[PDB]
Amino acid sequence: AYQGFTKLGNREPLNDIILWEQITPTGHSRKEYTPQASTEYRVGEVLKADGTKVQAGEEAQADSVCIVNFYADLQLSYHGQLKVVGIHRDAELKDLLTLEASVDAAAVKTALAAKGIDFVPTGL
Amino acid sequence: AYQGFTKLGNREPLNDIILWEQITPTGHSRKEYTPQASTEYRVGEVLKADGTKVQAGEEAQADSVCIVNFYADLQLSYHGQLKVVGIHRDAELKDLLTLEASVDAAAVKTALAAKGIDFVPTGL
Amino acid sequence: MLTNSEKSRFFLADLTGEVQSIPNTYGYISNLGLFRSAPITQTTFLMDLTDWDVSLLDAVDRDSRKAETSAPERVRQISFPMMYFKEVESITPDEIQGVRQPGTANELTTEAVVRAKKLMKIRTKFDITREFLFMQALKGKVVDARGTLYADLYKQFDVEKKTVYFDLDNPNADIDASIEELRMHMEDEAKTGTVINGEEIHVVVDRVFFSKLVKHPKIRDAYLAQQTPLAWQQITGSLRTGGTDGVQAHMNTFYYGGVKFVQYNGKFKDKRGKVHTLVSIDSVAATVGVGHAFPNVSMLGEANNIFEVAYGPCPKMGYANTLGQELYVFEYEKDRDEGIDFEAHSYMLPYCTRPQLLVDVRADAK
């Protein structure tokens, strides 16, 4: 290696944060978003109503939590689906949120809790 | 898939353009270059004396023809080597050259011909 | 056998032969067998790393019916380059035209003798390089004698390095404390998931460190006050009871606290002229004692070997995807019977899979 080491990257997070959700013939707690251009999505990310991620100063606009890893350059998810899917209604999720820079986690959690989403405190 | 198709890319050009060279110990007909500026290198490219690719308006500065594929992010050749290599004298090569935009092939061929590098016609 | 006299061509004197001086070679590590041979058919190789951890559990109220959960594991991947070595040599008729053999009177040199001598020199050079590379790998960073950096294990695997200070200069300093620190580090930082005995380790030190350790008052008095064969042998016997390196028939050895200390004098010269001591530590004055510690093979068994060597194929035709060999030797004939030329090739990289178990030892204190 030029620097003495090479790193091929870590495995993307797997969709296992869901501990409980409302089962229904059609997904009652799941919603579909049109993927925004040139945006990379990963499990545990917070999205606004329009499908864009939540940045600092707008935590009150948090709408849903992403569930599928989406590759922008392919315009296709890792499961071959055309759309992004996120949780937007009552459910229990592992406390493994991924947030942008300078985003206050507490505000996001309070905003989401109003929709019935609770976070189980994960161990180590 | 979005837009109805996805292309994973063509295979990189193989190192088979060499028909004849001055085979002697220590590689009399080969020279090494230091990679720089995260530049991607591919077989058949023309390099200046400083290791950079020839561009329009400076065809007279052509020095050697690249022989190895180099990846900028890995900072390693496709064979796991640290340095770029090229042919700079006493060789016969196929006509499968690669040139930057607006570069005249006649000028680079004439410049390289002065160093004893010849090209053989290729019938598709 | 008779030759011309010193100051007259008409008188003869008797020649009694030759005496040869051969440079020293050491090759100590190469004989321990620590490094296994792992030939491969490619110019690079990969590895996978898996990690997980656990923590204590917090009490919750019974009626609330709340609970806890554990985070998932982390998987990662890495890669390695490899080092290539090559050298050339040739034989021409001018080397045998009228050249007398050193040990005789009127016998001429022949092609066979030069061939054998040059091949032996090539093999010696390659053995020296292999020993140097093994020692460099054991240090934790693989760098060529020219100074190029090829592998940095402490960065390849995200982990740091530990140094242990003995403070042998201080008369009141305790050594058992440092030995226990080393033992606990080796026992705790493995994270192999099984029971580990840290008593199984090699400790290789230099001359100054060995002398300071042996001559410390606390060790000397303690071993002097005991009536047992080990005490007698070390205090007033000969400490040279170890194995053989490439030069001397026994290596200085010392026993204390269940640890075995060995003195290694190996050193080589770069073609730039400088001297590369094998046991030294980078950027530390040679006046200070220095050593290196690493686990034994039995500390984990062959099922979990830690040291390996990889061998790649030769660039020449007919070896495109072969398994690879330690050394290649080729011969070709020059044009119109002008002479012979040889070539020797090598392609290898030694590495370690758990670099955090390599500990450096120092005689000073900080």
PDB file of N, CA and C in Angstrom, chain A residues 1-11 14 16 19 92 94 96 120-124, chain C residues 46 53 55 67-70 72 75-81 149-152 155-156 158:
ATOM      1  N   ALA A   1       0.831  -1.196   0.000  1.00  0.00           N
ATOM      2  CA  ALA A   1       0.000   0.000   0.000  1.00  0.00           C
ATOM      3  C   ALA A   1       0.869   1.250   0.000  1.00  0.00           C
ATOM      4  N   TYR A   2       0.374   2.311  -0.640  1.00  0.00           N
ATOM      5  CA  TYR A   2       1.143   3.549  -0.715  1.00  0.00           C
ATOM      6  C   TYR A   2       1.372   4.139   0.671  1.00  0.00           C
ATOM      7  N   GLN A   3       0.341   4.141   1.511  1.00  0.00           N
ATOM      8  CA  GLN A   3       0.452   4.622   2.880  1.00  0.00           C
ATOM      9  C   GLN A   3       0.760   3.511   3.873  1.00  0.00           C
ATOM     10  N   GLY A   4       0.871   2.266   3.411  1.00  0.00           N
ATOM     11  CA  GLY A   4       1.090   1.140   4.288  1.00  0.00           C
ATOM     12  C   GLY A   4      -0.164   0.404   4.705  1.00  0.00           C
ATOM     13  N   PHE A   5      -1.335   0.819   4.228  1.00  0.00           N
ATOM     14  CA  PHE A   5      -2.575   0.146   4.580  1.00  0.00           C
ATOM     15  C   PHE A   5      -3.626   0.451   3.523  1.00  0.00           C
ATOM     16  N   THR A   6      -4.519  -0.511   3.308  1.00  0.00           N
ATOM     17  CA  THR A   6      -5.654  -0.353   2.411  1.00  0.00           C
ATOM     18  C   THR A   6      -6.921  -0.771   3.139  1.00  0.00           C
ATOM     19  N   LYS A   7      -8.010  -0.051   2.880  1.00  0.00           N
ATOM     20  CA  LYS A   7      -9.289  -0.319   3.527  1.00  0.00           C
ATOM     21  C   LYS A   7     -10.378  -0.297   2.468  1.00  0.00           C
ATOM     22  N   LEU A   8     -11.127  -1.391   2.363  1.00  0.00           N
ATOM     23  CA  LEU A   8     -12.180  -1.523   1.368  1.00  0.00           C
ATOM     24  C   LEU A   8     -13.550  -1.111   1.892  1.00  0.00           C
ATOM     25  N   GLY A   9     -13.635  -0.610   3.118  1.00  0.00           N
ATOM     26  CA  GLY A   9     -14.877  -0.101   3.655  1.00  0.00           C
ATOM     27  C   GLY A   9     -15.606  -1.127   4.508  1.00  0.00           C
ATOM     28  N   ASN A  10     -16.517  -0.623   5.334  1.00  0.00           N
ATOM     29  CA  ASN A  10     -17.297  -1.468   6.223  1.00  0.00           C
ATOM     30  C   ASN A  10     -18.606  -1.888   5.559  1.00  0.00           C
ATOM     31  N   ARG A  11     -19.157  -2.996   6.043  1.00  0.00           N
ATOM     32  CA  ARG A  11     -20.448  -3.458   5.557  1.00  0.00           C
ATOM     33  C   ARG A  11     -21.533  -2.458   5.931  1.00  0.00           C
ATOM     34  N   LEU A  14     -27.447  -3.487   8.308  1.00  0.00           N
ATOM     35  CA  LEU A  14     -28.544  -4.340   7.880  1.00  0.00           C
ATOM     36  C   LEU A  14     -29.845  -3.904   8.541  1.00  0.00           C
ATOM     37  N   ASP A  16     -32.312  -4.399  10.683  1.00  0.00           N
ATOM     38  CA  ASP A  16     -32.745  -5.169  11.842  1.00  0.00           C
ATOM     39  C   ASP A  16     -33.121  -4.274  13.017  1.00  0.00           C
ATOM     40  N   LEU A  19     -37.984  -3.620  16.012  1.00  0.00           N
ATOM     41  CA  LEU A  19     -38.355  -4.612  17.014  1.00  0.00           C
ATOM     42  C   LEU A  19     -39.846  -4.924  16.984  1.00  0.00           C
ATOM     43  N   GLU A  92     -41.435   0.433  17.286  1.00  0.00           N
ATOM     44  CA  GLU A  92     -40.330   0.381  18.234  1.00  0.00           C
ATOM     45  C   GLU A  92     -39.056   0.049  17.472  1.00  0.00           C
ATOM     46  N   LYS A  94     -34.541   0.167  17.385  1.00  0.00           N
ATOM     47  CA  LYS A  94     -33.297   0.255  18.133  1.00  0.00           C
ATOM     48  C   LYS A  94     -32.720   1.660  18.024  1.00  0.00           C
ATOM     49  N   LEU A  96     -30.314   3.526  17.119  1.00  0.00           N
ATOM     50  CA  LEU A  96     -29.149   3.569  16.242  1.00  0.00           C
ATOM     51  C   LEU A  96     -29.353   4.593  15.135  1.00  0.00           C
ATOM     52  N   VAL A 120     -35.736   1.911  21.782  1.00  0.00           N
ATOM     53  CA  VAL A 120     -35.274   1.018  22.842  1.00  0.00           C
ATOM     54  C   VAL A 120     -33.792   1.287  23.081  1.00  0.00           C
ATOM     55  N   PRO A 121     -33.362   1.544  24.318  1.00  0.00           N
ATOM     56  CA  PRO A 121     -31.944   1.865  24.553  1.00  0.00           C
ATOM     57  C   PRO A 121     -31.071   0.638  24.340  1.00  0.00           C
ATOM     58  N   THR A 122     -30.335   0.628  23.233  1.00  0.00           N
ATOM     59  CA  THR A 122     -29.484  -0.506  22.912  1.00  0.00           C
ATOM     60  C   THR A 122     -28.307  -0.583  23.877  1.00  0.00           C
ATOM     61  N   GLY A 123     -27.853  -1.806  24.120  1.00  0.00           N
ATOM     62  CA  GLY A 123     -26.674  -2.019  24.925  1.00  0.00           C
ATOM     63  C   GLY A 123     -25.418  -1.616  24.175  1.00  0.00           C
ATOM     64  N   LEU A 124     -24.316  -2.249  24.561  1.00  0.00           N
ATOM     65  CA  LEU A 124     -23.030  -1.993  23.924  1.00  0.00           C
ATOM     66  C   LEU A 124     -22.737  -3.063  22.881  1.00  0.00           C
TER      67      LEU A 124
ATOM     68  N   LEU C  46      -6.783 -10.825   0.445  1.00  0.00           N
ATOM     69  CA  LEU C  46      -7.733 -10.102   1.276  1.00  0.00           C
ATOM     70  C   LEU C  46      -7.967 -10.848   2.584  1.00  0.00           C
ATOM     71  N   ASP C  53     -19.093  -6.899  20.962  1.00  0.00           N
ATOM     72  CA  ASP C  53     -18.797  -6.603  22.355  1.00  0.00           C
ATOM     73  C   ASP C  53     -20.072  -6.692  23.179  1.00  0.00           C
ATOM     74  N   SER C  55     -21.776  -5.596  27.299  1.00  0.00           N
ATOM     75  CA  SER C  55     -21.686  -4.677  28.426  1.00  0.00           C
ATOM     76  C   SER C  55     -22.654  -5.150  29.504  1.00  0.00           C
ATOM     77  N   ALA C  67     -37.084  -3.030  28.434  1.00  0.00           N
ATOM     78  CA  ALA C  67     -35.959  -3.946  28.299  1.00  0.00           C
ATOM     79  C   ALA C  67     -34.798  -3.221  27.631  1.00  0.00           C
ATOM     80  N   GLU C  68     -33.772  -3.992  27.280  1.00  0.00           N
ATOM     81  CA  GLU C  68     -32.578  -3.498  26.611  1.00  0.00           C
ATOM     82  C   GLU C  68     -32.327  -4.333  25.364  1.00  0.00           C
ATOM     83  N   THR C  69     -31.345  -3.910  24.570  1.00  0.00           N
ATOM     84  CA  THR C  69     -30.999  -4.614  23.346  1.00  0.00           C
ATOM     85  C   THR C  69     -29.519  -4.408  23.058  1.00  0.00           C
ATOM     86  N   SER C  70     -28.943  -5.337  22.300  1.00  0.00           N
ATOM     87  CA  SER C  70     -27.528  -5.299  21.961  1.00  0.00           C
ATOM     88  C   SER C  70     -27.334  -4.870  20.512  1.00  0.00           C
ATOM     89  N   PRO C  72     -25.536  -4.622  16.757  1.00  0.00           N
ATOM     90  CA  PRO C  72     -25.039  -5.693  15.888  1.00  0.00           C
ATOM     91  C   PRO C  72     -23.526  -5.647  15.733  1.00  0.00           C
ATOM     92  N   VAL C  75     -18.354  -5.837  10.425  1.00  0.00           N
ATOM     93  CA  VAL C  75     -17.543  -6.610   9.493  1.00  0.00           C
ATOM     94  C   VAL C  75     -16.737  -5.644   8.635  1.00  0.00           C
ATOM     95  N   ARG C  76     -15.481  -5.999   8.371  1.00  0.00           N
ATOM     96  CA  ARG C  76     -14.571  -5.131   7.641  1.00  0.00           C
ATOM     97  C   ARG C  76     -13.651  -5.989   6.783  1.00  0.00           C
ATOM     98  N   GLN C  77     -13.006  -5.347   5.809  1.00  0.00           N
ATOM     99  CA  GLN C  77     -12.157  -6.039   4.850  1.00  0.00           C
ATOM    100  C   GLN C  77     -10.882  -5.235   4.626  1.00  0.00           C
ATOM    101  N   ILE C  78      -9.812  -5.936   4.245  1.00  0.00           N
ATOM    102  CA  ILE C  78      -8.504  -5.313   4.062  1.00  0.00           C
ATOM    103  C   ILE C  78      -7.762  -5.974   2.905  1.00  0.00           C
ATOM    104  N   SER C  79      -6.579  -5.453   2.577  1.00  0.00           N
ATOM    105  CA  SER C  79      -5.800  -5.947   1.450  1.00  0.00           C
ATOM    106  C   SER C  79      -4.319  -5.721   1.721  1.00  0.00           C
ATOM    107  N   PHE C  80      -3.478  -6.408   0.942  1.00  0.00           N
ATOM    108  CA  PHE C  80      -2.031  -6.341   1.105  1.00  0.00           C
ATOM    109  C   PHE C  80      -1.315  -6.335  -0.241  1.00  0.00           C
ATOM    110  N   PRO C  81      -0.272  -5.506  -0.398  1.00  0.00           N
ATOM    111  CA  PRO C  81       0.634  -5.667  -1.542  1.00  0.00           C
ATOM    112  C   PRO C  81       1.755  -6.646  -1.226  1.00  0.00           C
ATOM    113  N   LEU C 149       7.981   2.118   2.735  1.00  0.00           N
ATOM    114  CA  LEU C 149       6.981   1.505   3.601  1.00  0.00           C
ATOM    115  C   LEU C 149       5.998   0.711   2.753  1.00  0.00           C
ATOM    116  N   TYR C 150       5.890  -0.585   3.029  1.00  0.00           N
ATOM    117  CA  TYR C 150       4.992  -1.475   2.304  1.00  0.00           C
ATOM    118  C   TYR C 150       3.779  -1.899   3.115  1.00  0.00           C
ATOM    119  N   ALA C 151       3.948  -2.166   4.408  1.00  0.00           N
ATOM    120  CA  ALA C 151       2.842  -2.562   5.268  1.00  0.00           C
ATOM    121  C   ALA C 151       2.992  -1.899   6.628  1.00  0.00           C
ATOM    122  N   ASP C 152       1.871  -1.423   7.171  1.00  0.00           N
ATOM    123  CA  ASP C 152       1.813  -0.808   8.498  1.00  0.00           C
ATOM    124  C   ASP C 152       0.684  -1.501   9.253  1.00  0.00           C
ATOM    125  N   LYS C 155      -1.849   0.275  11.558  1.00  0.00           N
ATOM    126  CA  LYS C 155      -2.893   1.013  10.859  1.00  0.00           C
ATOM    127  C   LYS C 155      -3.801   0.108  10.040  1.00  0.00           C
ATOM    128  N   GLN C 156      -3.257  -0.964   9.461  1.00  0.00           N
ATOM    129  CA  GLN C 156      -4.095  -1.923   8.748  1.00  0.00           C
ATOM    130  C   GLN C 156      -5.183  -2.461   9.666  1.00  0.00           C
ATOM    131  N   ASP C 158      -6.874  -1.471  13.185  1.00  0.00           N
ATOM    132  CA  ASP C 158      -6.924  -0.264  13.997  1.00  0.00           C
ATOM    133  C   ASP C 158      -6.575  -0.587  15.443  1.00  0.00           C
TER     134      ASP C 158
END
